[PDB]
Design a protein around this ligand. Structure first.
Ligand SMILES: N=C(N)NCCS(=O)(=O)O
Ligand SMILES: [Cl-]
Ligand code: NA
Ligand code: NA
Lengths: 107, 118, 529
């Protein structure tokens, strides 16, 4: 079971600042097999980034992704109140499928 | 593609059994692999099981592989998850998720059903 | 990992691109060849290549045995594929025999095809420079005919056995034996040279060709299509089965390579890139050949269709001429034939290795390891040597042309491609097979692949097959020589040897299976472990 861990478990932040989040895997994950999901407080998750950099249909363009091998990251050019959510990384390379610990942006 | 809706959440005793349902609409349910994902009261996401489009390939998480059974009804566009012996750790919010392409992830998520084992 | 990519690239890039494609295109008047060529390429070629690779990777079985896990009833497809490779390995290496002979003839102060002071030349020789000033013959052509080939007047006149070409065949078969036996010439860093040098020499030849005076006429011949010819089934079969030949499909060799790939490996993008490499080198080396043909037409004062052989010797006429038009011709002659030898020898290694892995998978009780697998490989090589040795006689060119037309080309490839696509799409099921592909690579084939298997490939194969029988024309070696009827019967014998494996294996499996007919069919239609 490939364990995924995200370092900044909680992120105090204010509008206008840039943000980057980290997602490390116990085993190497292929670039096409890592995804990021948003989950607004009290609602079900939604796909946010796929194939490590491809933005989903509804995500604003300000989001971006990067990474390779055992480490991955997702970034925001500048945050807004609408971006206050919990973001989970997920490997889809091999079973069991595993989600990261999740990182919550507080403002 | 529009909609997924779960049903059948409720309260059951420890060690009991429960069956969840997830109806699909707005897309050809028979053409997409389906997955169940689980969110604990600690809000941590955990994957449960995947069933492919034809139901021939099925995968389980190691923590449920002996107790959970996943199935689908392509003739009725409904997805099912059956739990045989619910442990205390199995109380959670359950989402059915559409996962046809591994390089694209879970496109759509249902509203979710809560499962309680008080 | 790149072991798979290198294996495929070295396997199905080879003499099919550098030697066969130019001669089939020239035989069919140039531009008209490309329309059916690309129609088949994008309709069947790439999808069926991906299909073979996916069969191999899914079953992890080699060539013959994978059909036991997909559709046992149609197991005859594997035997047909393996016998196709058996005949291909017999006749394909004779081209390397000719290349070896040319290379050994390169070791001279002056190349023997540059002029005709030499003994073998007809009194009607005219050195190509002076012809523009009767039925004169070029020294480059009659070196091929009278020194290398020593061409007999017909297949009915075997003549003697060329004692030198026999030892050339022996040398190349020894190389194949020691490479396949020890596993040498693969997976090493030396492959950095082996995989790159041939394309470098192809670039050199292309740059020579495009700069020769009169190249533009050859390119116009190459690219402008006479739609009238297309009315003839010959161009359609030639182009479609050239696609199937060049991609090494219907051999089961690509399936054999796929069986070594990991189950969860995403192969789709690699397959598409490799197909781009293959068809691209074919199309690009077309510009190398036809520029030289235009130059020869301009120099000699005859139409492009008349300058060279409408047959297998087109490469051994064109490139030898080109290397004569470069500084220090001997250097470039040696490099050209070393390029040809390397490029064909890895495709020979891959094909023989595929044949052997497919055959040892039938009986792993024997044929287990070097104690007897080496001996089995030695037996295969010896037998293939004795059969290829028939093409080294003075009449060997006619036998080689008959083999190249019928044994691993033409209708026998259409047959296997049709049955592979038909089985997977309609007997096994596109819905099942797309789910298997989704399980392995992570996403379904999509509509291009699905409909190529379901409709386009069956339709194209059946259409060309029937069209060539409604508008039948017999084989001819170089547009003048007409084969005797028993030779045509022999060619159809070669083709049917491959084709009949499907009916006969079907009846063999319906027999010896127990129960009423209905349950027999149902049982054979059901996969097995
Ligand atoms: N021999 C076959 N059929 N394929 C090998 C590749 S190629 O040299 O024919 O292009
Ligand atoms: Cl080709
Ligand atoms: Na080659
Ligand atoms: Na090729």
């Amino acid at each position: 079971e490939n364990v995924l861990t995200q370092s900044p478990a909680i992120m105090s932040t204010s509008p206008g600042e840039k943000v980057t989040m980290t997602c490390r895997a116990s085993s190497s994950v292929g670039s096409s097999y890592l995804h990021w999901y948003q989950q607004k407080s009290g609602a079900s998750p939604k796909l946010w980034i796929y194939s490590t950099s491809n933005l989903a249909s509804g995500v604003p363009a300000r989001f971006s992704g990067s990474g390779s091998g055992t480490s991955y990251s997702l970034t925001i050019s500048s945050v807004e109140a609408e971006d206050a959510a919990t973001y989970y990384c997920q490997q889809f390379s091999g079973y069991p499928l595993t989600f990261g610990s999740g990182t919550k942006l507080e403002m | 593609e529009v909609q997924l809706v779960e049903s059948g959440g409720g309260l059951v005793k420890p060690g009991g059994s429960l069956k969840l349902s997830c109806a699909a609409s707005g897309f050809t349910f028979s053409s997409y692999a389906m997955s169940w994902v689980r969110q604990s009261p600690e809000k941590r996401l955990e994957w449960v099981a995947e069933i492919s489009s034809g139901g021939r390939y099925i995968y389980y998480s190691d923590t449920v592989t002996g107790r959970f059974t996943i199935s689908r009804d392509n003739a009725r566009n409904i997805l099912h998850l059956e739990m045989s012996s619910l442990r205390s750790e199995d109380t959670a919010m359950y989402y059915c998720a559409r996962g046809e392409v591994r390089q694209r992830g879970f496109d759509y998520w249902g509203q979710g059903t809560t499962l309680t084992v008080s | 990992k790149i072991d798979f990519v290198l294996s495929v690239a070295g396997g199905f890039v080879g003499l099919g691109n550098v030697w066969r494609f130019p001669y089939l295109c020239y035989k069919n008047g140039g531009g008209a060849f490309l329309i059916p060529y690309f129609i088949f390429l994008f309709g069947s070629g790439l999808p069926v290549f991906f299909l073979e690779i996916i069969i191999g990777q899914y079953t992890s079985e080699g060539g013959i045995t994978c059909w036991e896990k997909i559709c046992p009833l149609f197991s005859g497809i594997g035997y047909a594929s393996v016998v196709i490779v058996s005949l291909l390995n017999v006749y394909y290496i004779v081209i390397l025999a000719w290349a070896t002979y040319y290379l050994f003839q390169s070791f001279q102060k002056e190349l023997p095809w540059a002029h005709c002071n030499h003994s073998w030349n007809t009194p009607h020789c005219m050195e190509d420079t002076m012809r523009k000033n009767t039925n004169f013959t070029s020294p480059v052509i009659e070196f091929w005919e009278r020194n290398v080939l020593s061409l007999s007047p017909g297949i009915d006149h075997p003549g003697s056995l060329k004692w030198d070409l026999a030892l050339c065949l022996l040398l190349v078969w020894l190389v194949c034996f020691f490479c396949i036996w020890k596993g040498v010439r693969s997976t090493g860093k030396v492959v950095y040279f082996t995989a790159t040098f041939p394309f470098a020499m192809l670039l050199v030849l292309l740059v020579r060709g495009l700069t020769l005076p009169g190249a533009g006429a050859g390119i116009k011949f190459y690219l402008y299509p006479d739609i009238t010819r297309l009315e003839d089934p010959q161009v359609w079969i030639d182009a479609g089965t050239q696609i199937f030949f060049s991609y090494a499909i219907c051999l089961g060799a690509m399936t054999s390579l796929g069986s070594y790939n990991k189950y969860h490996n995403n192969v789709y993008r690699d397959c598409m890139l490799l197909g781009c490499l293959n068809s691209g080198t074919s199309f690009v080396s077309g510009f190398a050949i036809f520029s030289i043909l235009g130059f020869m037409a301009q120099e000699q004062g005859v139409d492009i269709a008349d300058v060279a052989e409408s047959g297998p010797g087109l490469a051994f006429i064109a490139y030898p001429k080109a290397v004569t038009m470069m500084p220090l011709p001997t250097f470039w002659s040696i490099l050209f034939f070393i390029m040809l030898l390397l490029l064909g020898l890895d495709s020979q290694f891959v094909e023989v290795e595929g044949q052997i892995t497919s055959l040892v998978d039938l009986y792993p009780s024997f044929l287990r390891k070097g104690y007897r697998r080496e001996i089995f490989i030695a037996f295969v090589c010896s037998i293939s040597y004795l059969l290829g040795l028939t093409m080294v006689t003075e009449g060997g060119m006619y036998v080689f042309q008959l083999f190249d037309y019928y044994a691993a080309s033409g209708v026998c490839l259409l047959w296997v491609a049709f049955f592979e696509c038909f089985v997977i799409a309609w007997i096994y099921g596109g819905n099942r097979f797309s789910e298997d592909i989704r399980d392995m690579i992570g996403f379904p084939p999509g509509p291009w692949m699905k409909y190529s298997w379901a409709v386009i490939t069956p339709v194209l194969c059946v259409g060309c097959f029937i069209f060539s029988l409604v508008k039948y024309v017999p084989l001819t070696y170089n547009k003048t020589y007409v084969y005797p009827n028993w030779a045509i019967g022999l060619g159809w014998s070669l083709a049917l040897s491959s084709m009949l494996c499907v009916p006969l294996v079907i009846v063999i499996r319906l027999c010896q299976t127990e129960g009423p007919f209905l349950v027999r069919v149902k049982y054979l239609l059901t996969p097995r472990e």
